Design a binder for these strands. Structure first.
Ligand SMILES: [Zn+2]
Ligand SMILES: [Zn+2]
Lengths: 138, 160, 119, 120, 98, 214, 56, 56
DNA sequence: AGCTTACCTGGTG
RNA sequence: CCCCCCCCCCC
DNA sequence: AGGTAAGCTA
């Protein structure tokens, strides 16, 4: 109950079966394009890979799933800090606009509050884990 | 079937095998990429005899492949049951890859007999950055290359 | 496969050839890190996968009432106390093999008579 | 002209095959002089097959090597070769018929089973 | 069906409070390789945190509802194989007595 | 031997079908010419290596006495086979002039893989003569021989005139055969020409239909 | 059904109605036959409209 | 008839053992799939057949 | 080339 | 929005 | 929703 923010988050797996560079992008409300997950994480403050990878794949032994994520790291590699990540979600005007979308419209259940980037990060990570689990036929 | 081979079950089998589509993907277990620097030898000791049979004699214009090939190895493991199932030779399979990529891909293979079924491929450089090129060539290999049959003809069943 | 990260910025490590000494290294593309490769294997495909069959074998596997029970003696402890499931590999082709978990030693074993399996 | 250079290297590995394969005859119910001569009786025997009337050959050399080399299942068949079994028919043999009797066990079980499932 | 009812909707915060007071580590401080077996706890599709001995937790909650302390309409599942614990305070769920 | 054997078979199979089509078209060809065996074909059109020499295969065909009666203006035909898998514009001109000088009525070019867009442009270039192009592969099997393919008969202008009179028909009102239709191509149907189709009937035994070319 | 054990490919689990209409159906037999029957009514409604248009 | 009912029940019973047997055969990987069929697609065809032969 | 997009979708009361 | 009709039939 | 056949944007 409360305004009823009917915003549905889509986490897409691009590339088909036996197609080179299978990238993962997510569609955020009030942003035209589907942003590569790696940027969304860096926008949330989780900057290194293997920290972003740590949030998606829990078992650091599952080589199958980890190789399924190597293309995502490449797609996101162009951005390296939170600013550069918030800006890709667009000057000064776009960076501020981004913070707002991720706060109140991205994963509005959980919280619309503020400092719950880790709680929303592990959640996005849970979605990507769930996505790859079906893709690997598990 | 032809009017004279109406009951010849072997004629049916023979057409059935000659018409049914068979890709390199159909017989592959797993594909692999290794850093095998000197092409004249191997880091993988399993393939010690594979180089000792083919990279061996001949010797069909040695160096032949300039031997100034590629340090990046592409290795395919083929299924023994699936190979015999669709009736295929390692030589057959090898010749299809060898004929697909012509002289820009140096191919070798483990023999039918051998405990493991392996196809060793190296890129042929004319006169840096290759890791991507191999993932491109293996995608071609699996999804494209036809080994036996007519395209679109997917499953072939015999009937009396 | 089983890959590493850059100690210094935890970022992914990409391959690089040391042509002079004919050896493989892994470099950081966010800093000046480099390290000798462990194995010569770089990429592994796997078209026919067999990993994801014995998935979710938690020690509490016995506490699931939905799971059936058999009176097959254990090949390691010899207990007629089992909880059995079928291949967790959710692929169309998948064989109807049975995986049995002992409720007196917590060790898995199959009904498979085609292969001498130890996984 | 260039064929001679290629044909020489072919006989070379046949004598190699006949030096370290000739040992299980003497180890279990049947020196290098016997090998070189016996190895020549394949090089020109396989040459009768290639360039017919007027490519195949090289692959047939490897099949002959790998299989007759094998042991200890294929040495029981390789024993028949040195002790009166066609050296003329064994050259144009080339297939799954060369393979281990152990391998042929499974090859026979497999083939007869495909036929049952696609005969519909 | 005659005996079926539909959830009216309850309050989640008392369960959320009970959970953290019963071994529920917060998501804010999760380290996957430090807690690899860890069961994920969800109160209305909101991932709250992880729990190290889900067996005993599940028992406590079940005994709480059966006694009356957790509203009877509240749904709680333990997917042992998937390492997950989903709970629903949620309005609209169709239920039947057993 | 390997896969040279298969190419020789196919080329001979397509040669037969060309001869079959030429005969069916009206031209003088014997069944002996048609039923020519493979071993004889090899021994006539193959070099020292026993490899196909297509340039030799090309032939001239003259209309039969029967054909001369229906279509008096039906002239002689020329059929050419090329040893170049891709038939070049330099080769096409050589052919076009042959048909113009020897004043051939029709010219058929049997190609392996392709004919240059350059070459295939100098095709309607020499009227009243008409040029045709067939891919060797399409000719391997005679489609007219099929179970489902009934006999099509090319009608004389006089025969067409009569059909139209006897059914009080405007050309629009006749059922239609497409110009690019396999049987239309086989018979070298020109637009406006009519084909009498005689097929078996489960109701009457024999039923004759007609189709006009588009 | 939640009355069955996991990985049950048996005639009973997968919906075999061993009983005659005279003897009567078990709750399970009743419910599977209920799903089977439901399918029929759907492709009736579907075919009725599809077939109608085909005629037109 | 009472005797007819016995003959019916045993006919269903034997098809049920027949089915259990092919289930044991498939669980021990001793089952070989038909052309263009999953090992499972094959098993189901066999099972359905046994039961439909039975009801007839 | 592969997006999009309008066209229709049983009968009576 | 219902109503309507919902044939036949495993061998 | 779905198959088609125009229609046109990167
Ligand atoms: Zn670094
Ligand atoms: Zn045990």
């Amino acid at each position: 109950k409360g305004s009823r923010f009917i915003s549905t988050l889509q986490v897409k797996l691009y590339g088909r079966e036996g197609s080179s560079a299978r990238t993962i992008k997510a569609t955020l409300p009030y942003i035209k394009q589907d942003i590569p997950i790696v940027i969304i994480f860096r926008a949330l403050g989780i900057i290194p890979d293997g920290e972003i990878l740590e949030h998606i794949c829990y078992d650091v032994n599952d080589w199958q799933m980890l190789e399924m994520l190597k293309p995502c790291v490449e797609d996101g590699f162009v951005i390296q800090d939170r600013e550069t990540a918030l800006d890709f979600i667009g000057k000064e005007k776009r960076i501020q606009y981004a913070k707002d979308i991720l706060q109140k419209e991205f994963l509005p259940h959980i919280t619309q509050l503020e400092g719950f980037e880790s709680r929303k990060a592990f959640f996005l990570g849970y979605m990507i884990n769930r996505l790859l689990l079906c893709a690997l036929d598990r | 079937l032809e009017p004279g081979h109406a009951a010849d079950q072997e004629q049916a089998k023979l057409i059935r095998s000659a018409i049914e589509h068979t890709t390199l993907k159909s017989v592959t277990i797993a594909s692999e990429i290794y850093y095998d620097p000197d092409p004249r030898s191997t880091v993988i000791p399993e393939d010690e005899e594979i180089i000792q049979l083919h990279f061996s004699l001949l010797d069909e214009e040695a160096e032949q492949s300039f031997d100034q090939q590629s340090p990046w190895l592409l290795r395919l493991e083929l299924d023994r049951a699936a190979m015999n199932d669709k009736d295929l030779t390692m030589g057959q399979v090898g010749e299809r890859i060898k004929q697909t990529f012509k002289n820009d891909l140096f191919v070798i293979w483990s023999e039918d007999n051998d405990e493991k079924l392996i196809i060793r491929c190296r890129v042929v450089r004319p006169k840096a950055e290759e890791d991507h090129m191999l993932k491109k060539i293996e995608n071609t290999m699996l999804e494209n290359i036809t080994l036996r049959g007519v395209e679109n003809i997917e499953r072939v069943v015999m009937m009396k | 496969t089983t890959f590493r990260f850059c100690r210094d910025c935890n970022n992914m490590l990409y391959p690089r050839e040391d042509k002079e000494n004919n050896r493989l290294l892994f470099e950081c593309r966010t800093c000046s890190y480099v390290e000798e490769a462990g194995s010569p294997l770089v990429y592994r495909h796997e078209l026919i996968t067999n990993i994801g069959e014995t998935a979710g074998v938690v020690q509490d596997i016995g506490s699931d009432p939905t799971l059936p029970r058999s009176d097959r003696e254990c090949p390691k402890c010899h207990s007629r106390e089992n909880v059995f499931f079928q291949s967790q590999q959710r692929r169309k082709d998948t064989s109807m093999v049975l995986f049995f978990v002992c409720l007196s030693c917590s060790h898995i074993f199959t009904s498979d008579q085609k292969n001498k399996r130890t996984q | 002209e260039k064929e001679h250079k290629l044909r020489y290297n072919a006989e070379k590995m046949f004598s190699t095959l006949f030096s370290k394969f000739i040992v299980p005859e003497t180890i279990e119910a049947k020196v290098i002089s016997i090998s070189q001569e016996f190895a020549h009786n394949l090089e020109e025997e396989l040459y009768k097959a290639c360039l017919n009337v007027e490519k195949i050959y090289t692959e047939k050399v490897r099949s002959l090597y790998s299989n007759l080399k094998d042991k200890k299942n294929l040495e029981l068949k390789a024993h028949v070769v040195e002790g009166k079994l066609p050296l003329n028919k064994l050259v144009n043999m080339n297939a799954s018929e060369l393979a281990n009797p152990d391998l042929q066990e499974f090859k026979e079980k497999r083939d007869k089973i495909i036929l049952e499932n696609f005969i519909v | 069906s005659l005996m079926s009812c539909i959830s009216v909707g309850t309050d989640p915060m008392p369960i959320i409070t009970f959970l953290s007071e019963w071994g529920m580590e917060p998501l804010e401080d999760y380290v996957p390789h430090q807690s690899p077996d860890a069961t994920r706890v969800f109160v209305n599709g909101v991932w709250h945190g992880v729990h190290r001995n889900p067996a005993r937790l599940m028992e406590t909650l079940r005994t709480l509802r059966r006694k009356g302390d957790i509203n009877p309409e509240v749904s709680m599942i333990r997917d042992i194989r998937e390492k997950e614990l989903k709970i629903f305070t949620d309005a609209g769920r169709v239920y039947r007595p057993l | 031997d390997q896969e040279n054997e298969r190419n020789i078979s196919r080329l001979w199979r397509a040669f037969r079908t060309v001869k079959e089509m030429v005969k069916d078209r009206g031209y003088f060809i014997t069944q002996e010419e048609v039923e020519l065996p493979l071993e004889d074909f090899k021994a006539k059109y193959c070099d020292s290596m026993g490899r196909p020499q297509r340039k030799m295969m090309s032939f001239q065909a003259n209309p039969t006495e029967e054909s001369i009666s229906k279509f008096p203006d039906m002239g002689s035909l020329w059929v050419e086979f090329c040893d170049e898998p891709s038939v070049g514009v330099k080769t096409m001109k050589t052919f076009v002039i042959h048909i113009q000088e020897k004043n051939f009525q029709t010219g058929i070019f049997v190609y392996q893989n392709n004919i240059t867009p350059s070459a295939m442009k100098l095709v309607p270039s020499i009227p009243p003569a008409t040029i045709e192009t067939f891919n060797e592969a399409a000719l391997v099997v005679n489609i007219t021989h099929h179970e489902l393919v009934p006999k099509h008969i090319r009608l004389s202008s006089d025969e067409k005139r009569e059909l139209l009179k006897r059914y009080r028909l405007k050309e629009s009102q006749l059922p239609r055969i497409q110009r690019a239709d396999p049987v239309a191509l086989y018979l070298g149907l020109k637009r406006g020409e009519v084909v009498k189709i005689i097929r078996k009937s489960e109701t009457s035994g024999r039923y004759a239909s007609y189709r006009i070319c588009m | 059904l939640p009355h069955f054990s996991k990985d049950d490919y048996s005639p009973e689990s997968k919906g075999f109605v061993e009983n005659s209409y005279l003897r009567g159906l078990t709750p399970q037999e009743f419910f599977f036959h209920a799903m089977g029957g439901r399918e029929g009514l759907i492709d009736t409604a579907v075919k009725t409209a599809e077939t109608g248009y085909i005629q037109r | 008839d009472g005797p007819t009912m016995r003959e019916i029940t045993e006919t269903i019973a034997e098809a049920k053992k027949k089915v259990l047997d092919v289930t044991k055969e498939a669980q021990a990987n001793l089952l070989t799939a038909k052309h263009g069929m999953t090992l499972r697609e094959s098993f189901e065809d066999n099972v359905v057949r046994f039961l439909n032969e039975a009801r007839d």
